[PDB]
């Protein structure tokens, strides 16, 4: 019959060839990630100074879970764990071509498999030189803060003591609901784990555990200009001006292994 048939990547792959394919995919992912590790050594776009009214790009992170955190005051604060995975700038949109008010930058994280995706999605990522990402999200970024596509983004962009805004899809409940984007504002950051790129954020984050979320600087009037004392475009590990500690703590936070807090 001259008719369409259903096929999958593993349909005709032999056991010996299938094992080779798995190894090749891992090799390709490793090579692509290493190639993009150094943004500053890949013709970085011009760096502009900070001025009032600048907006930095946001990050996409995975919700690991929640646990209690203690401060030097002896108070216990429940905190949520967010992990930044394979965060990279993908597509830059000019201000005029996207929105006359401000330009936007596309960032994607949480790399995904290439086997069960359309060729169109793979083709776009092949040009970018990076493996496909689970989610594409758009961030409004000022011209001065524009970053070249393919620049790796790390949890060190945010710092302890900075309030941040997280928006995520709510858990779906079925017909009775949910699965709607919501944003939480005014969440302080307690600590950042550089080794695992884990940011500790006060309060709860909508969605289930292991759910991707969008993270951006707090837009509240009180924290109008916090990027002045933070990495203005972003934090670049490639420069390595000073290696950051593996775990970053806020001053009030009580680190473990410290002396027992006495309410003197």
């Amino acid at each position: 019959l001259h008719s369409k048939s259903s096929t999958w990547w593993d349909e005709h792959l032999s056991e010996e060839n299938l094992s080779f394919v798995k190894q090749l995919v891992s090799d390709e992912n490793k090579t692509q990630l290493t190639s993009k590790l150094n943004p500053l050594k890949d013709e970085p776009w011009p760096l502009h100074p900070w001025e009032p009214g600048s907006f930095r790009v946001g990050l996409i992170a995975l919700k690991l879970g929640m646990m209690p955190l203690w401060t030097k005051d002896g108070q216990k604060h429940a905190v949520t764990l967010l992990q930044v995975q394979d965060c990279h700038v993908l597509k830059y949109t000019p201000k005029e071509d996207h929105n006359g008010k401000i330009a936007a930058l596309t960032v994607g994280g949480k790399t995904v498999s290439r086997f069960y995706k359309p060729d169109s999605r793979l083709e776009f990522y092949r040009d970018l030189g990076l493996p496909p990402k689970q989610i594409h999200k758009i961030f409004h970024v000022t011209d001065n803060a524009v970053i070249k596509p393919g620049t790796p983004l790390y949890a060190a962009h945010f710092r302890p003591g900075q309030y941040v805004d997280v928006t995520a899809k709510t858990i779906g409940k079925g017909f009775q609901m949910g699965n709607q984007n919501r944003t939480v504002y005014g969440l302080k950051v307690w600590r950042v784990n550089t080794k695992h790129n884990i940011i500790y954020v006060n309060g709860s984050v909508p969605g289930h555990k292991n759910c991707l979320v969008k993270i951006k600087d707090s837009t509240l009037p009180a924290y109008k200009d916090s990027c002045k004392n933070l990495p203005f475009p972003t934090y670049f590990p490639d420069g390595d001006e000073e290696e950051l500690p593996e775990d970053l703590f806020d001053e009030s936070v009580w680190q473990p292994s410290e002396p027992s807090i006495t309410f003197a």
């Binding site: 008719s3 369409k4 048939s5 259903s6």
Partner: protein, 108 residues
């Protein structure tokens, strides 16, 4: 509660001939080389399975007669032997089922 008016055949025809209500074709149909009959990609062939399944009943019938009683399941391993095949030393201490038929080609 009854409709305020009879529904026209033309309106009825559109509802029943909507593509959503029509029967969908399947593209996952596959051929069985063993039996030469059709099959689905995720479904095993049945024409050959009939030989194996019905062959199992014949083996089971022989086993049932040999046991001869309920609740007589042996505590030792069992093996099936066909005509022209003789027990080996490895077959010692194992229930032996004898089949008049010659060793089937598919069965190994």
């Amino acid at each position: 509660a009854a409709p305020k008016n009879r529904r026209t055949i033309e309106v009825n025809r559109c509802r029943r001939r909507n593509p959503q209500k029509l029967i969908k074709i399947k593209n996952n149909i596959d051929i069985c080389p063993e039996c030469g009959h059709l099959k689905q990609k995720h479904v095993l062939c049945g024409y050959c399975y009939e030989k194996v399944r019905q062959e199992t009943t014949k083996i089971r019938q022989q086993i049932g007669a040999q046991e001869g009683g309920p609740f007589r399941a042996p505590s030792v391993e069992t093996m099936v032997l066909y005509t022209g095949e003789k027990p080996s030393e490895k077959d010692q201490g194992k229930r032996i089922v004898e089949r008049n038929i010659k060793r089937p080609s598919w069965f190994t």
